[PDB]
Amino acid sequence: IQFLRTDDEVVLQCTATIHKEQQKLCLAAEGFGNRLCFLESTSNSKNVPPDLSICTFVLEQSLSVRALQEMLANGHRTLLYGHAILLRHSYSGMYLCCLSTSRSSTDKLAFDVGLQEDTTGEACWWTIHPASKQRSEGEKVRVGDDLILVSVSSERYLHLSYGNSSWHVDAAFQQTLWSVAPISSGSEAAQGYLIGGDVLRLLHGHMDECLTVPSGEHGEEQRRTVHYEGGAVSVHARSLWRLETLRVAWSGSHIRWGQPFRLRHVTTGKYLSLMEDKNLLLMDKEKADVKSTAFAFRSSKEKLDVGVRKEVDGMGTSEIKYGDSICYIQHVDTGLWLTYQAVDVKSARMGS
Amino acid sequence: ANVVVRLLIRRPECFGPALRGEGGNGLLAAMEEAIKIAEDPSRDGP
Amino acid sequence: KGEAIRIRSILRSLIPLGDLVGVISIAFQMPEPDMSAGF
């Protein structure tokens, strides 16, 4: 029932039936190093999490085709069918567009989609059209509605061109239902409160001990180790942890206490998993099971609440602040709690 | 012209199968196959 | 006009140029009369 406004991060999802199996795929793009776009399996997240950081897109502007043409000649607005929307990548900062190059020689009539830096020209904007008979032009868009994206210059639909091994999105003349899932509606997110889908660092109140991993001085086998450090490591890049929410809708909502989420190390790309045979380690997305990677934040040390909440459709309530907040990490399976130790021998303790 | 082009590009099967689609290469091979069929009377109506 | 440019680009992507010249170059036979129901 919520109407898509402007300056809100969304996700372009769609359905794909291959091998008599249905799957949910969102439109993602690396941006830095690769301009062309690809797909990310948003479904099947219990075993492998998707890359929402590159899957989300934000609506920069929302103008009609005629106002857009007048712009070519020369707050938070709502989204209506028939407008010429503008999609900007969240992380890469570039803008989704329709490239004039053809990579797949099979569809000799389609184009390739990708990201571009400049917003000039009518080769970057996209128009939304109704996909079902129950809706028509001129109506307000709501959450969960299936729409059709059409290029302005290319005049080609955002088609999900099926291939043997190339699941690539093209700008073809075959309509494809692109469902839109919100992430962050741009509500009154007060500066300092915790927002989901964000990367942060964890310090101590009286010890400023940051949760880090060994640097590139040794190999990945050493870098998989997790420990505490201090000093200049607080401003380094190997001390950043991203909180990925399980649900793909409203993933950038306000983090509430006790909900599961994955910890990702953006420096190496591995997820913080816990194998009870040892301490916690870093395992990649291919084997990052939700029962071993999903952690939660509590306000106390007790285990009073486990099976309480499952999902809340909304932006959420501002609960956790960045300034003054004492959270406690807790696992969904074992329910252990963090503790600092003195495993370091007295041989070279003061220096290391 | 604009509206007919729109309709013809939205419905790709209006063109020949040997010219448009993931099958036949293009108009060249299409017309060469057509000439071959015209020369070989085994592909007509007796 | 830009719409004309887009339509021309669509037509060019539909029908290539080498295709056109290859189909033009067939050198039809010129005949004893023959049939005009062929190429």
From Swiss-Prot, chain B:
It comes from the Eukaryota. Channel activity is modulated by phosphorylation. Phosphorylation is increased in failing heart, leading to calcium leaks and increased cytoplasmic Ca(2+) levels. Highly expressed in heart, lung, cerebellum and brain. Detected at lower levels in adrenal gland, stomach, thymus, esophagus and ovary. Disruption phenotype: Embryonically lethal. Embryos die at about 10 dpc, due to defects in heart tube development. Cardiac myotubes display enlarged rough endoplasmic reticulum and cytoplasmic vesicles that contain high levels of Ca(2+). It is found in: Sarcoplasmic reticulum membrane. Cytosolic calcium-activated calcium channel that mediates the release of Ca(2+) from the sarcoplasmic reticulum into the cytosol and thereby plays a key role in triggering cardiac muscle contraction. Aberrant channel activation can lead to cardiac arrhythmia. In cardiac myocytes, calcium release is triggered by increased Ca(2+) cytosolic levels due to activation of the L-type calcium channel CACNA1C. The calcium channel activity is modulated by formation of heterotetramers with RYR3. Required for cellular calcium ion homeostasis. Required for embryonic heart development. Homotetramer. Can also form heterotetramers with RYR1 and RYR3. Interacts with CALM and S100A1; these interactions regulate channel activity. Identified in a complex composed of RYR2, FKBP1B, PKA catalytic subunit, PRKAR2A, AKAP6, and the protein phosphatases PP2A and PP1. Interacts directly with FKBP1B, PKA, PP1 and PP2A. Interacts with FKBP1A and FKBP1B; these interactions may stabilize the channel in its closed state and prevent Ca(2+) leaks. Interacts with SELENON. Identified in a complex, composed of FSD2, CMYA5 and RYR2. The calcium release channel activity resides in the C-terminal region while the remaining part of the protein resides in the cytoplasm. Belongs to the ryanodine receptor (TC 1.A.3.1) family. RYR2 subfamily. This is Ryanodine receptor 2. The chain holds residues 2316 to 2361 of 4966 of the full protein.
